[PDB]
Amino acid sequence: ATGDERFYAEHLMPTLQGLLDPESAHRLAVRFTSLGLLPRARFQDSDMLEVRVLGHKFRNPVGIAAGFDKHGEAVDGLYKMGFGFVEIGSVTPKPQEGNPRPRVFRLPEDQAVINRYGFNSHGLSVVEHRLRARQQKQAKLTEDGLPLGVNLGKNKTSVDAAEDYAEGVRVLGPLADYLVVNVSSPNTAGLRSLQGKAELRRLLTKVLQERDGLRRVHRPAVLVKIAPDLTSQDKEDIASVVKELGIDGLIVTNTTVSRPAGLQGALRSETGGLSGKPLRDLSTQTIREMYALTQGRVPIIGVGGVSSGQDALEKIRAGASLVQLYTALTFWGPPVVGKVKRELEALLKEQGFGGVTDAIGADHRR
Numbered sequence: 001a002t003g004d005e006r007f008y009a010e011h012l013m014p015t016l017q018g019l020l021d022p023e024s025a026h027r028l029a030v031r032f033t034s035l036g037l038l039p040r041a042r043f044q045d046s047d048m049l050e051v052r053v054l055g056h057k058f059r060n061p062v063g064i065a066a067g068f069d070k071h072g073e074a075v076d077g078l079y080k081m082g083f084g085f086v087e088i089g090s091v092t093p094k095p096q097e098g099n100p101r102p103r104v105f106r107l108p109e110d111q112a113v114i115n116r117y118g119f120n121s122h123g124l125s126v127v128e129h130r131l132r133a134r135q136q137k138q139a140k141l142t143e144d145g146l147p148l149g150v151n152l153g154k155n156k157t158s159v160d161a162a163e164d165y166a167e168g169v170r171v172l173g174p175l176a177d178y179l180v181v182n183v184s185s186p187n188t189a190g191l192r193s194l195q196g197k198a199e200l201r202r203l204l205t206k207v208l209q210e211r212d213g214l215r216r217v218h219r220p221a222v223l224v225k226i227a228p229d230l231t232s233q234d235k236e237d238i239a240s241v242v243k244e245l246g247i248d249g250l251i252v253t254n255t256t257v258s259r260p261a262g263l264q265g266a267l268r269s270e271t272g273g274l275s276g277k278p279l280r281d282l283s284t285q286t287i288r289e290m291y292a293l294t295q296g297r298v299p300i301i302g303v304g305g306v307s308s309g310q311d312a313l314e315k316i317r318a319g320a321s322l323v324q325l326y327t328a329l330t331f332w333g334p335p336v337v338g339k340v341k342r343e344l345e346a347l348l349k350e351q352g353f354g355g356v357t358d359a360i361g362a363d364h365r366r
């Protein structure tokens with residue numbers, strides 16, 4: 001536990017949260033990061049943390065989830081933070097404003113956040129030109145094991161969900177190492193209910209067909225991102241379509257519209273998606289079903305309440321080849337990346353794993 005770690009957690013972070021509403025704090029976090037105002041990442045990634053999945057090297061499995069850098073403004077500062085991969089978005093075809101403020105709320109007693117941004121996005125065009133300005137720098141980064149994922153969404157007013165997702169595949173597909181069809185946002189009318197078996201099958205057919213129309217070196221992988229609120233019927237059906245259509249992987253899982261017993265924050269009854277520790281195990285259990293339903297054959301990026309190596313390692317052993325975090329960064333600050341990696345590596349060694357790859361799905365073999 002470094003000096004940066006304890007300093008950012010016990011002093012810097014609680015002071016910023018004391019002066020700043022969460023949306024303001026988010027906006028500043030992005031600026032600082034875009035400018036590279038960040039502490040030294042004194043963790044040097046080891047060979048044990050290397051993962052080869054989705055036709056790519058990841059030099060560590062700890063990524064920043066979608067929603068932090070919605071518009072592509074701080075990608076390089078996030079690699080410098082120490083993440084092994086970066087996912088930007090959600091991006092919607094047309095620019096849109098999102099929900100009226102206030103739309104973000106802290107539950108500090110729960111290590112939790114509730115948000116209803118409602119897909120505030122600069123739009124495909126602005127993000128496309130943003131990413132084009134660094135497209136070749138990113139080609140090198142990918143080669144070095146730091147890939148880039150782009151998360152796609154649809155417009156509030158949009159009439160045909162699949163045409164929104166196809167536009168995104170066409171415009172930002174050539175710039176991404178993987179694309180994410182986000183059919184799980186709680187904050188858009190109709191979006192989570194983008195799994196009507198044959199509905200989801202039709203949407204994902206048009207996405208994969210669009211993706212295959214791109215030139216070989218600009219063909220990303222395509223993932224689906226699902227909610228932790230799914231019935232057992234829904235998960236069985238998602239598993240079925242994913243294997244039928246050859247979907248390249250699953251991101252598990254977006255925030256929850258549930259409110260687990262025991263939440264203590266005053267703001268717990270705010271409308272929106274809950275993230276952080278109340279999501280952790282509900283997240284880990286969805287990795288676990290999805291892995292089993294797909295016979296461990298569909299890569300999974302696990303996400304939900306990860307703030308430590310134990311949290312990351314439980315998700316990997318439950319099926320994840322990669323993990324993401326977001327909420328933990330808003331309490332710990334940048335040092336949380338090095339902290340999770342350092343702890344992940346130590347646990348891998350004590351539990352007898354040769355590396356991350358040996359531990360993927362390990363719980364399903366005990």
Ligand SMILES: CC(F)(F)COc1cccc(-c2c(F)c(F)c(NC(=O)c3c(O)nn4ccccc34)c(F)c2F)c1
Pocket residue numbers: 012016017021022023025026027028029030032033037038039104105106113329330331333334
């Ligand atoms: C030189 C230096 F010392 F300044 C280096 O400091 C840094 C460097 C880099 C980043 C940060 C930084 C920060 F300033 C923050 F305000 C936040 N807070 C939030 O993002 C936040 C929150 O609070 N609620 N919330 C709810 C929803 C979404 C986001 C958030 C943060 F996550 C940060 F990572 C600080």
Ligand SMILES: Cc1cc2nc3c(=O)[nH]c(=O)nc-3n(C[C@H](O)[C@H](O)[C@H](O)COP(=O)(O)O)c2cc1C
Pocket residue numbers: 065066067068070089090104113115117151182225253254255274275276277279303304305306324325326327328
């Ligand atoms: C403020 C905020 C904004 C988010 N925006 C998006 C988004 O645009 N697209 C998406 O797929 N997930 C979004 N998420 C969900 C996260 O990507 C993630 O799935 C879940 O919050 C992360 O688990 P964790 O925050 O507990 O680490 C957002 C989450 C928060 C807290």
Ligand SMILES: O=C(O)c1cc(=O)[nH]c(=O)[nH]1
Pocket residue numbers: 090115116117118119120182184185186187254255273
């Ligand atoms: O933009 C949002 O409000 C949003 C999107 C999403 O996928 N998840 C979330 O928690 N919020």
